[PDB]
Enzyme design. Structure first.
Site, PDB file in Angstrom:
ATOM      1  N   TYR A 100      44.248  -0.419  33.602  1.00 48.15           N
ATOM      2  CA  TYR A 100      43.588  -1.542  34.249  1.00 48.15           C
ATOM      3  C   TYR A 100      42.154  -1.098  34.174  1.00 48.15           C
ATOM      4  CZ  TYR A 100      41.352  -4.502  37.725  1.00 48.15           C
ATOM      5  OH  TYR A 100      40.457  -5.375  38.303  1.00 48.15           O
ATOM      6  N   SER A 152      44.862  -8.498  33.104  1.00 51.00           N
ATOM      7  CA  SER A 152      43.532  -8.908  33.567  1.00 51.00           C
ATOM      8  C   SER A 152      42.396  -8.103  32.912  1.00 51.00           C
ATOM      9  CB  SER A 152      43.437  -8.830  35.104  1.00 51.00           C
ATOM     10  OG  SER A 152      43.456  -7.495  35.593  1.00 51.00           O
ATOM     11  N   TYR A 153      41.692  -7.290  33.695  1.00 48.53           N
ATOM     12  CA  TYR A 153      40.617  -6.478  33.138  1.00 48.53           C
ATOM     13  C   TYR A 153      41.344  -5.564  32.171  1.00 48.53           C
ATOM     14  CZ  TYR A 153      36.119  -4.080  32.856  1.00 48.53           C
ATOM     15  OH  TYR A 153      34.925  -3.638  32.371  1.00 48.53           O
ATOM     16  N   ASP A 159      44.966 -20.802  34.378  1.00 49.10           N
ATOM     17  CA  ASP A 159      44.332 -19.656  35.014  1.00 49.10           C
ATOM     18  C   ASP A 159      42.956 -20.003  35.550  1.00 49.10           C
ATOM     19  OD1 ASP A 159      43.345 -17.019  35.740  1.00 49.10           O
ATOM     20  OD2 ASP A 159      44.680 -16.140  34.232  1.00 49.10           O
ATOM     21  N   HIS A 161      46.384 -16.878  37.221  1.00 49.53           N
ATOM     22  CA  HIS A 161      46.128 -15.528  36.744  1.00 49.53           C
ATOM     23  C   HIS A 161      47.221 -14.500  36.948  1.00 49.53           C
ATOM     24  CE1 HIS A 161      43.795 -12.370  35.011  1.00 49.53           C
ATOM     25  NE2 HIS A 161      43.943 -11.626  36.094  1.00 49.53           N
TER      26      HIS A 161
END
Ligand SMILES: CC(C)[C@@H](Nc1ccc(CNC(=O)[C@H]2SCCN2C(=O)C[C@H](N)Cc2cc(F)c(F)cc2F)cc1)C(=O)O
Ligand SMILES: CC(C)[C@@H](Nc1ccc(CNC(=O)[C@H]2SCCN2C(=O)C[C@H](N)Cc2cc(F)c(F)cc2F)cc1)C(=O)O
Lengths: 726, 726
Positions: free
Chosen positions: A509, A592-593, A670, A702
Site C-alpha cells: 500500500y 488504492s494507492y 468510485d 472505492h
C-alpha cells in the site's frame, strides 16, 4: 490432520473476531450490547444492570441499526434508512424516544432524509443538518430553529463537509461543533460554487432503463477549492430572539492572503475556541485562539495568542496538524508536533508564550494524546522495544517529565505490542485494545491505581478454533539500507522450510505516512494465500512511511512516485538474495494507492516480477483531489511541480508492461479514485499493444464493499496468483 | 515450405485487397483515383485523360481526404476536419474550388464545423446543414439562404437525422433530398424535445482532468420517439423573395392516428414526390404520392394515389420498405415487396391502379432494383444455383417477363457467385463486383450489347502472394431440419483431414434478416484461426435469416432470442455428430447482436460449449433503441410483448454460466449497444458468484475501430481461444 485457512474460510468468514465496543456515558459507566438486550456496565465492581430492553423495539415497523443516548440519559436517538454516500457521510431518518416516560415521541420529529444529527456534550440539545441547513432543538418534542437559510445542495454545505473536506481533512461529515456546556454552537460553511464536478454512471438494478449520471463537486489537484467560512451561535437566546444571530470568525490574515483550508477546530473553555487554518501550500499553517466578549458579543482573537506552525521539509503533520489538548482552566495546551530531529512529541504551549516545551524526546514518534488530567498525560507511541508498528500506552506526569510510565508494555508482550484505547470521562477508567501480535484482547483498568481489574474479551473461543487448523505466522522485522533500517514483514506459510524455493507476493500500500509493517494481527486475504497456497505475503515500509521520523516520511515531498516505488523494488531485490525467494516467481499487488505504486513498479524494467494486480489505482495525479495531492506535490503548474505529475504517471511507463502480466480492477462508481484513472491505464496499453487482464465492478465505490463483489474480486485474484505461480 | 495467415499477417494487414471504386459523372465517364493524381476514364474505349492534378493541392495547409464534383464539373468540394460521430454522421469543414478559373474561392465560404453539404443532381446548387439549420447557395461564391431558423441542437434537427433515424431507418445523415432538376428541395425535421437521453463517459487523452459526460437523444424501446415533419421549398425564388417559403407535406391520416416514422422518400418527376410513412407497430405502412400545384402552390396528394402495404407475419420489408423506382414519365413504378409465398419480387404498380403485377416469381428473394430503362430492369437476387448467399445480376425485359437474362452467371462461376453493381447514368455502362468465392474481380460492361469490355482489377497480385502461403478454404452448404434446409459454412484448415479430431468455433452474428452463410471471400480473423491455429470457424443461418423467404425470416417476430439462438445450438449439435468435431472442444463467439446470441447460447444448459466470447452484446431489450427493437418485439408493455423482453434477457440465464467460460468485452463509449447492457451482464454474474473474463475498451464506440484497440481485441481473443483449446 487439520485443513487450512481457505478462500471460503475467509470470504464467507467462518472464523469470527469478538470485539467489545463500548461507550462511556460518564466517568464510571458505559454501554455494551449483548445482541438481544443492551446492558449498562458499572466501570468498577461491574454490577451490570440492564439499560434498555430489546423486545421494546420489535413493533417498530422499521429496521433499526443504531442508537444514541444523550448525556441526560433521557433520550435515545434511533437510526434507520442508512444510505451510505461517501466514506463517513450517510443520509438516514431518525426517531427520538423519551426514556423516562417509556413512550415514543410523535409530533415535531426530525425530518426524514436528514444528513447529520447529534447530542450536545451536556443537556439533550439536538443540532442537525438537513437539505444542507442547520436546525437546532433545545427540547426533543418542541419545534426547532433554523440557524441557516443559504444552504443550497452541491453548492452551500452548512454543518456538513463536501466531498474533499470529508475524505482528506476531517475524515467525517459533522461540520458543527458543540461547546462544552451546550451554550454555543459553531458550524463551517462551504461555497462550492466554482468547484468542478466529476460525473459518471451508476446503473442500479436491472430494472433501471436509463443510467444515472452522478455529479459531485470534487477539486482534482490544481483546480478550484471550495472556499470555507466559520461561525458561532448562541443556542440559548435562539429560542427567544426570532432569527438566531450567527457571528462569524474570519481571518487569520496570514490565511486571507490566498487559498486556505480549516485544519482542526476544538474548544478549550465555554468561551474559548481554537481554530487551525492551513494554507494551500500545506507547509504553512496558523492556529488561532478566540474568546467570547460579554460587551461586544463578538469573538475576538488577540493576535498575541496565535501559534504559527511551519514545515521546511514538507506538509504540516501526518495528514493534518494534530488537535490541541487544553488544560482545565484553558490557558495551556498540548499538541503533538514535529520537533527538531523531526519526531512528533507533545509540545506544551501557553496561550501567550509563543514557544513551547517538548515533554518527550527520542527516535520514536508519538501517536496520540488520549487523556489529560492535571496529573498525567496518557498518550500512545512506538517507543517500547524500539519498533515503529509497536503501539503502547504511556502516562507521563505533568510535574516531572521523568515520571513516564508504560502501562501496556508487560501486560503480556508475548501477545501484545499494538494498542489503542478508550477512556472514561474523568479518565478514572480506561479500556485497552491489544490488537496484535496474537489474538485481540480487550481489558479494563482503573486509573487512580492503574491496576488491571478484569478481562473483557480474550478470544479463547476463536483461539481454540485455530488449533484445529494450520495457521501461518508473522515475522516482522527490518533490513538495513543507506545506513538506515527499513521495516518489512512476511506472512510465512506453516511448517516454513528456509531451504526450499517458494513464491513471494509483495502486498504494498505504502503511501505517504502509512505503515505496512506492524504487529497488527489480521485474518485477511494475506492469511489465505500464505497457508493454503503457500505463497509468502510481504509488505515493506520505504522512504515515505510514517511513524518513523520526518527524514523517512518527508523524503518524498514533491517526488511522489519515485522512492516509495523504488524502495519497493529495491526491497523485492533484498528478498531475492534470501534463498526461499525463488527469483523466477515474485509478485506485487496493491489496492488504492497500493495499486498506483504496484503500477509504477511494473513499468520500471525491474523485471523483478512475473505478474501484478492493481485495484482502483491512481495513475496520473491530476486525477485525484487537491487537498491530498497538492500536499505531496504542490501545485500542478510550471511554477511549482507540474513537471513531475507528468513524470510520475502510470501511462508513460505503459511500454515496460510488455514483460509483466498486469491486472487492472476498478469500481465503475468510485467516488475516490475515479474510474477515469483506470480508463486511461487500459487505453494506455491498448495504444502500446500490450495484452493485460481487465476486470471492472459495476456500481462499486472505492472499496468494492458489497458482499458479492467482495467475495468476487478476491476470488478472481486467487485464480490469477495461483496461475502465475502454481 | 510456406507459413500461414498469422495474427500479424492479419492485424498489421500485409495482404492487401485492391479495389476500383469509381464514380460516374455522366453516362459514359467516371472518376478513378491513382494515389497521386486523379484520372478521368472514358467508359468506352477507355482513353483516360487526367482530370485533376495531385500537386495542385500540396500547398493547402490542411489535410484533405475527400472531394465532390458537381454535375457541371465546374466545382470540386474539398473535405477535411473529419470528425466521426455515429455510423454515418460526420462533422467537418469544406472548401469550394472553381475548376474552370483554376483558382480557390475565398469569401462567403461554407462555415467551419458543417454537418452535411451536397450538390444537386444537376447544376451546382449547394444545400447544407450547420448548427442544425438548412442553408442553400445557388452559386458558390454568392452568399447563402437560411431555409430554417428553428434548428436547435439535440432537439430540432433540420436536414439531418438524429441518432435513431440514422442507425435503424435511413442509414445516413443527409436528411434533405434534392429534386431532379434542382428546382425543389425537400427536408425532414425532428422535434426531439421529449426524446430521452443516454449519458456516459468519454475520457480523451491522459491530459483531460475531468471526464466528459456525453448526452445524446436515444429512444430505448418503448420510450418516446422524436416526432417527424416533412417539407419542400422552391430553391429558385428563395434567392428573390426574402424568406424562402417552406411548404409542408403532412398526413397520411392512417399515420396521424398515432406514433409514426418516415420510411423512404424519393422523387419520380420534377413535380412528383413519393413518401413512405411507417406506423410504430411496423406491420402497417402507407406510401403517398404528391404532386406540385401551379395555382395553389401546395403539394397535394390525391388520396386515390396511395399504396397501403401491410404484413400479417411481422414488419414490412427487410429493415424498412424498399424504395420505389419510377418510370421516366412518372406514373408507373417498381418496388420489391413481400409476395404471396413471402418472397420479395419486383411488383409493378400504377399511380392509380391500386394492385400490382409481380414481374418475378419463385423461391429466391430479389436483392435490389439497380437500373430501370424503358427496356430492361437490372436487379440482383439469389436465384442462380439456388443458393441464398448467391448474388447475381439479371436483366428482365419490361415487355416480356420471360426475357430474363443473367449477366454475372457464367463470367466465371468457378470464381464468382457474389455480386453487386455500379451503373452509369443512362445505364449505358455498368461495373460488376465479383466479391466471392475466389478473389474480388471488378469488371466493365457495355449495356447496349451487354458485352464484357475489359478487366478493371483481377487481384493477380494478391493472388500470386497466396501461393507462397497455405490459405484455408470455404465449404459453404446446407443441412436439413424440420423438412427445411438451413445454410451454414465452414472456414476449414489447410490439408483438411476428415478423420482427425479438430476444435470448432461458431462465429455467429445471425440477427434478423442477416446472412452468415454466403460466398463472400474475406480475409478476417476467421482466416487466421482456421489456418495457423487449425480451429474450424463456422457460421450458421437459422430461423430468422433473411434472403430466404418470410417463413424463415419472420419465424422470430416477437420471439427474438429464442429460435435464432436455439437453431444455433441445434446447429452446434449437427456438427458434433460429424466426426472431426471433437465434442470436448466446441466454441461460439459473436460481436454486437452476435454477442447477444452467443450470450443466450451460453446460458442454456446446452453444455455444447467449453467457452465463449461476446463483444458489445445486447442483454435486455429495453437497453436498445425502439425503431429497431419494437420492430422485432412490438412494445414493452403488458398489452403487447413486455413479458418476453423479460424472458429473453442475458441476465436471467446468469446461473447457467457456471459451466461455460464467458468473456465479456465492450466499448466504454458505445453510442449503440450502451456499455450499460454489459454493466448488467457482469453484475449479473457477480451476484450469482460466477467467475468470468471481462475486458473493456476506453472511449471505443460500437466497432472498437481505432487501430490500437482493433489490434488489441483480436489479440486478447486469440490468447483465449488458443487456451480454451490448444
Ligand atoms: C485499500 C483499503 C484497505 C483502504 N486503505 C486505507 C489505507 C489507509 C487508511 C488510513 N487513512 C488515513 O490515515 C487518513 S487520515 C485523512 C484520511 N486518510 C486517508 O487515508 C484518506 C485517503 N484519501 C485514502 C486514499 C488515498 C489515496 F492516495 C487513494 F488513491 C485512495 C484513497 F482512498 C484508510 C484506508 C481504503 O483506501 O479504503
Ligand atoms: C459486428 C460488426 C461486423 C457489425 N455488424 C453489423 C451487422 C449487420 C450490419 C448490416 N446492417 C443492415 O443491413 C441494416 S439496414 C438498417 C440498419 N441495419 C442495421 O444492421 C442496423 C442495426 N442497428 C445494426 C445492429 C447494431 C447493434 F449494435 C446490434 F446489437 C444489433 C444490430 F442489428 C451492419 C453491421 C457492426 O454492427 O458493427
Amino acid at each position: 490432520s487439520r485443513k487450512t485457512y481457505t478462500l471460503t474460510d475467509y470470504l464467507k468468514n467462518t472464523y469470527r473476531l469478538k470485539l467489545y465496543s463500548l461507550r462511556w456515558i460518564s466517568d464510571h459507566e458505559y454501554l455494551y450490547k449483548q445482541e438481544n438486550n443492551i446492558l449498562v456496565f458499572n466501570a468498577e465492581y461491574g454490577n451490570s444492570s440492564v439499560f434498555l430492553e430489546n423486545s421494546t423495539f420489535d413493533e417498530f415497523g422499521h429496521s433499526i441499526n443504531d442508537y444514541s443516548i444523550s448525556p441526560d440519559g433521557q433520550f435515545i436517538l434511533l437510526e434507520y434508512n442508512y444510505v451510505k454516500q461517501w466514506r463517513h457521510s450517510y443520509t438516514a431518518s431518525y426517531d427520538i424516544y423519551d426514556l423516562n416516560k417509556r413512550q415514543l415521541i410523535t409530533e415535531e420529529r426530525i425530518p426524514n432524509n436528514t444528513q447529520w444529527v447529534t447530542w450536545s456534550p451536556v443537556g439533550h440539545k439536538l443540532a442537525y443538518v438537513w437539505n444542507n441547513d442547520i436546525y437546532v432543538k433545545i427540547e426533543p418534542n418542541l419545534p426547532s430553529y433554523r440557524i441557516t437559510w443559504t444552504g443550497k445542495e452541491d453548492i452551500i454545505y452548512n454543518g456538513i463537509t463536501d466531498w474533499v473536506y470529508e475524505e482528506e481533512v476531517f475524515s467525517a461529515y459533522s461540520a458543527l461543533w458543540w461547546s462544552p456546556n451546550g451554550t454555543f454552537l459553531a458550524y463551517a460553511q462551504f461555497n462550492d460554487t466554482e468547484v468542478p464536478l466529476i460525473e459518471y454512471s451508476f446503473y442500479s438494478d436491472e430494472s433501471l432503463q436509463y443510467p444515472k449520471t452522478v455529479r459531485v463537486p470534487y477539486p482534482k489537484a490544481g483546480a478550484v477549492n471550495p472556499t470555507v467560512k466559520f461561525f458561532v451561535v448562541n443556542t440559548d437566546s435562539l429560542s427567544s430572539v426570532t432569527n438566531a444571530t450567527s457571528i462569524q470568525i474570519t481571518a487569520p490574515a496570514s490565511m486571507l492572503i490566498g487559498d486556505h483550508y480549516l485544519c482542526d477546530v476544538t474548544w478549550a473553555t465555554q468561551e474559548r475556541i481554537s481554530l487551525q487554518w492551513l494554507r494551500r501550500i500545506q507547509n504553512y499553517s496558523v492556529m488561532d485562539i478566540c474568546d467570547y466578549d460579554e460587551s461586544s458579543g463578538r469573538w475576538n482573537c488577540l493576535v498575541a495568542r496565535q501559534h504559527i506552525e511551519m514545515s521546511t521539509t514538507g506538509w504540516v503533520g501526518r495528514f493534518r496538524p494534530s488537535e490541541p489538548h487544553f488544560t482545565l482552566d484553558g490557558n495551556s495546551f498540548y499538541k503533538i508536533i514535529s520537533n527538531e530531529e523531526g519526531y512528533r512529541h507533545i509540545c506544551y504551549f501557553q496561550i501567550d508564550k509563543k514557544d513551547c516545551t517538548f515533554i518527550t524526546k527520542g527516535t520514536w514518534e508519538v501517536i496520540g494524546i488520549e487523556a489529560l488530567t492535571s496529573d498525567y498525560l496518557y498518550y500512545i507511541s512506538n517507543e517500547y522495544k524500539g519498533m515503529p508498528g509497536g503501539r503502547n500506552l504511556y502516562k507521563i506526569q505533568l510535574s516531572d517529565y521523568t515520571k513516564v510510565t508504560c502501562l501496556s508494555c508487560e501486560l503480556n508482550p508475548e501477545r501484545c505490542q499494538y494498542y489503542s484505547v478508550s477512556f472514561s470521562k474523568e479518565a478514572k477508567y480506561y479500556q485497552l485494545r491489544c490488537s496484535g501480535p496474537g489474538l485481540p484482547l480487550y481489558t479494563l483498568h482503573s486509573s487512580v491505581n492503574d491496576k488491571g481489574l478484569r478481562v473483557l474479551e480474550d478470544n479463547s473461543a476463536l483461539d481454540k478454533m485455530l488449533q484445529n487448523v494450520q495457521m501461518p505466522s508473522k515475522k516482522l522485522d527490518f533490513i538495513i539500507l543507506n545506513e538506515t533500517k527499513f521495516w518489512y514483514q512476511m506472512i510465512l506459510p506453516p511448517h516454513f522450510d528456509k531451504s526450499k524455493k517458494y513464491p513471494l507476493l509483495l502486498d504494498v500500500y505504502a503511501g505517504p505516512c502509512s505503515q505496512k509493517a506492524d504487529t497488527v494481527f489480521r485474518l485477511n486475504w494475506a492469511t489465505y494465500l500464505a497457508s493454503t497456497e503457500n505463497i509468502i505475503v510481504a509488505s515493506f515500509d520505504g522512504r515515505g512511511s510514517g511513524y518513523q521520523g520526518d527524514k523517512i516520511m518527508h523524503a518524498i515531498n514533491r517526488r511522489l512516485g519515485t522512492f516509495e516505488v523504488e524502495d519497493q523494488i529495491e526491497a523485492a531485490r533484498q528478498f531475492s538474495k534470501m534463498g526461499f525467494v525463488d527469483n523466477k516467481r515474485i509478485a506485487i499487488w496493491g489496492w488504492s494507492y497500493g495499486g498506483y505504486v504496484t503500477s509504477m513498479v511494473l513499468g520500471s524494467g525491474s523485471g523483478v516480477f512475473k505478474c501484478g494486480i492493481a485495484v482502483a489505482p491512481v495513475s496520473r495525479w491530476e486525477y485525484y483531489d487537491s487537498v491530498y495531492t497538492e500536499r505531496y506535490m504542490g501545485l500542478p503548474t510550471p511554477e511549482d511541480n507540474l513537471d513531475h505529475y507528468r513524470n510520475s504517471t502510470v501511462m508513460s511507463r505503459a511500454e515496460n508492461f510488455k514483460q509483466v502480466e498486469y491486472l487492472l480492477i476498478h469500481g465503475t462508481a468510485d467516488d475516490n479514485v475515479h474510474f477515469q484513472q483506470s480508463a486511461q491505464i487500459s487505453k494506455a496499453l491498448v495504444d502500446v499493444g500490450v495484452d493485460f487482464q481487465a476486470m471492472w465492478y459495476t456500481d462499486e465505490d472505492h472499496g468494492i464493499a458489497s458482499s458479492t463483489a467482495h467475495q468476487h474480486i478476491y476470488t478472481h485474484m486467487s485464480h490469477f496468483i495461483k496461475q502465475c505461480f502454481s
